[PDB]
Amino acid sequence: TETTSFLITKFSPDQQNLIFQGDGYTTKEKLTLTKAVKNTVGRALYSSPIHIWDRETGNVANFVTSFTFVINAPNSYNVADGFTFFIAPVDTKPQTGGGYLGVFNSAEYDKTTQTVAVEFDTFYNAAWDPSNRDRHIGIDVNSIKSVNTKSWKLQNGEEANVVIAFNAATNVLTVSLTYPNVTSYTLSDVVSLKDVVPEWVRIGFSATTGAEYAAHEVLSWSFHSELS
Amino acid sequence: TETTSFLITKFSPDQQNLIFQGDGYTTKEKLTLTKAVKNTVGRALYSSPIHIWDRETGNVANFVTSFTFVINAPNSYNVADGFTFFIAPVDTKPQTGGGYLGVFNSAEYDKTTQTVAVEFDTFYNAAWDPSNRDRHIGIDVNSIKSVNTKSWKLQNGEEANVVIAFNAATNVLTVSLTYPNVTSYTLSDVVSLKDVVPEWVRIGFSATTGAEYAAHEVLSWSFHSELS
Ligand SMILES: OC[C@H]1O[C@@H](O)[C@H](O)[C@@H](O)[C@@H]1O
Ligand SMILES: OC[C@H]1O[C@@H](O)[C@H](O)[C@@H](O)[C@@H]1O
Ligand SMILES: [Ca+2]
Ligand SMILES: [Ca+2]
Ligand SMILES: [Mn+2]
Ligand SMILES: [Mn+2]
């Protein structure tokens, strides 16, 4: 048995258990991924690698993470590009920015990326996003074109509580986003972790801007995993 | 609030959430610090830095750690040097070996060392060890000359269960050691953690051999800290 857990309900300016990439940094008790500026990327990784699956027994870890995040766009009508929670190899670095959200590089399935991300996409990219042009929650597996998505109305400036759980027995990854004014969205899909990501991974957040922009922030974060 | 927990009941050939130094490695499901050879040092740290106290609030964290260890001396009469569980600055590296247990450099107090350790000393070093020449458990603070100690009879090759707990309210550090055949030892003292170590630290194990030697292995390890 191997387990990993942490809880940070307030971020300090010298948060040494996180690995920052791009414009990502801590300030005023909040983790800032990107400011409201064009063409940036911000990423934050928890320092310790997680044992997501066991090569020897073939076991896969059960896990759940919770975080509260806020998106502040100066113009409630022009918002881009989004925020994501992602599971990737330990040595992971920012990928394509803008619509790619700093985690992927193509709309085509690329097994070499070995990355699963749960996106909060705020800008319609015609080449791969849902035709309805709605902002949405989506589950990505080695591609920026989600395997499943769910419309979501962004409440500019409001904090959203997100819970992402993965059940090892069913291979179901569930996502839930709740706003206080009480509006909730849920989305599920079967992800076969053991065949997408390496057995040791790093988890983090990622947010990007492009021609359109907004400030992406995390105010608290917990994670708990258990590999038997 | 900031909490960090982890539990490993079986070590893997590639235990990526641990940082090894000296001859420390994992094999046969155990963490091996030193083999039964002369003059070696082996350390293992948890990859993620821990927030042990906070300057702006003045708050210090409560923590507990449980581990099982084994010392195998080829000859129960000639055994050295010892094993330690320690808290030190994030960038910590192996220090002087032999009777300095890979954690300190002298028997004189040295503030820049910023290291608190709990030793399981199996060799009598005339210049600083307790005059009775007894194997002992000690609480070291910025010096290899323990602040407090307690005689301990080594049970060669046997599994020892240890619990080291720090109570932030009273600043009391307590250590307990138990052998199957049920022999127990306990020691405690008040350590002002906030005055000795930095805000962020890394925790781990250390073991060393010198002219006299023995194998030091850890069989399981859990840790939990909570800073309000
Ligand atoms: O910011 C909105 C959009 O800006 C464009 O300039 C980027 O090429 C595109 O990837 C992004 O989605
Ligand atoms: O191994 C037992 C002893 O061996 C000596 O050679 C080392 O100098 C000393 O530090 C150590 O305590
Ligand atoms: Ca998009
Ligand atoms: Ca000694
Ligand atoms: Mn999308
Ligand atoms: Mn001693």
Side-chain angles (χ1 to χ4, degrees), chain A residues 1-4 49-63 87-90 114-116 166-169 171 191-203 223 225-228, chain B residues 10 12-17:
Chain A
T1 304
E2 181 167 349
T3 93
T4 304
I50 312 297
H51 206 172
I52 213 62
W53 63 271
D54 184 5
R55 190 220 89 246
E56 181 182 305
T57 56
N59 278 15
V60 174
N62 284 307
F63 79 78
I87 299 171
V90 301
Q114 303 177 92
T115 297
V116 171
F166 176 84
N167 187 309
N171 283 125
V191 183
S192 190
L193 244 51
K194 185 167 61 177
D195 301 307
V196 178
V197 299
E199 64 187 282
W200 279 100
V201 298
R202 267 211 176 102
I203 56 176
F223 175 78
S225 67
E226 198 172 305
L227 171 64
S228 67
Chain B
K10 182 183 288 182
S12 44
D14 182 34
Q15 196 63 56
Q16 285 191 40
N17 53 348

Side-chain angles (χ1 to χ4, degrees), chain B residues 99 101 119-123 125 128-130 134 136-138 140 144-146 149:
Chain B
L101 283 8
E119 53 167 79
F120 296 83
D121 192 341
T122 50
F123 186 76
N125 297 89
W128 62 76
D129 274 336
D134 247 48
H136 54 290
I137 297 160
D140 308 338
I144 195 69
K145 179 176 175 184
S146 313
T149 56

Side-chain angles (χ1 to χ4, degrees), chain B residues 21-143:
Chain B
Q21 305 179 329
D23 300 322
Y25 75 118
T26 51
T27 207
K28 291 201 282 75
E29 301 177 340
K30 64 188 49 194
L31 159 58
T32 296
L33 265 4
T34 73
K35 298 197 197 69
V37 297
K38 291 175 70 163
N39 302 90
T40 52
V41 51
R43 308 169 115 210
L45 313 178
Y46 183 56
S47 53
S48 178
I50 304 296
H51 207 167
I52 214 60
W53 73 271
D54 180 25
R55 102 279 153 148
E56 64 172 275
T57 60
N59 279 32
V60 179
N62 286 87
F63 77 82
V64 216
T65 175
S66 292
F67 56 83
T68 300
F69 78 103
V70 188
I71 303 183
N72 290 265
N75 163 38
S76 44
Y77 201 87
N78 298 107
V79 193
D81 266 283
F83 168 94
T84 71
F85 162 74
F86 69 92
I87 299 157
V90 169
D91 48 272
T92 176
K93 279 148 47 285
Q95 298 298 303
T96 308
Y100 293 94
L101 283 8
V103 282
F104 299 98
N105 298 306
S106 64
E108 298 157 24
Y109 190 83
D110 181 19
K111 174 178 293 176
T112 63
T113 318
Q114 295 168 299
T115 302
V116 176
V118 169
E119 53 167 79
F120 296 83
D121 192 341
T122 50
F123 186 76
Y124 177 61
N125 297 89
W128 62 76
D129 274 336
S131 55
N132 70 348
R133 302 166 50 136
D134 247 48
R135 301 218 240 261
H136 54 290
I137 297 160
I139 293 175
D140 308 338
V141 178
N142 281 155
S143 161

Side-chain angles (χ1 to χ4, degrees), chain A residues 58-157:
Chain A
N59 278 15
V60 174
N62 284 307
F63 79 78
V64 50
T65 186
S66 296
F67 53 91
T68 289
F69 82 93
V70 177
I71 285 175
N72 276 295
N75 182 5
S76 198
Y77 291 137
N78 301 342
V79 191
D81 270 279
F83 160 98
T84 76
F85 168 74
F86 67 89
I87 299 171
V90 301
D91 298 294
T92 181
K93 302 150 304 76
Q95 305 292 275
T96 311
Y100 290 92
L101 302 168
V103 290
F104 297 105
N105 304 296
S106 65
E108 298 74 45
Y109 187 86
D110 190 352
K111 55 172 164 287
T112 72
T113 311
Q114 303 177 92
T115 297
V116 171
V118 172
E119 65 167 67
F120 298 87
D121 190 342
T122 57
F123 177 89
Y124 172 62
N125 293 99
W128 63 73
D129 281 332
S131 309
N132 53 54
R133 306 200 196 186
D134 285 333
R135 295 188 170 123
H136 47 289
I137 293 166
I139 296 175
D140 307 343
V141 181
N142 286 147
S143 167
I144 194 60
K145 196 192 191 70
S146 319
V147 303
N148 205 359
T149 70
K150 171 68 67 78
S151 294
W152 149 64
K153 297 77 192 175
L154 159 78
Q155 282 182 231
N156 194 36

Side-chain angles (χ1 to χ4, degrees), chain A residues 1-3 5 7 9 14 47, chain B residues 1 3 5 7 9 15 48 200:
Chain A
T1 304
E2 181 167 349
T3 93
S5 320
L7 174 57
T9 56
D14 191 30
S47 58
Chain B
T1 318
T3 60
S5 299
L7 161 79
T9 77
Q15 196 63 56
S48 178
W200 294 88

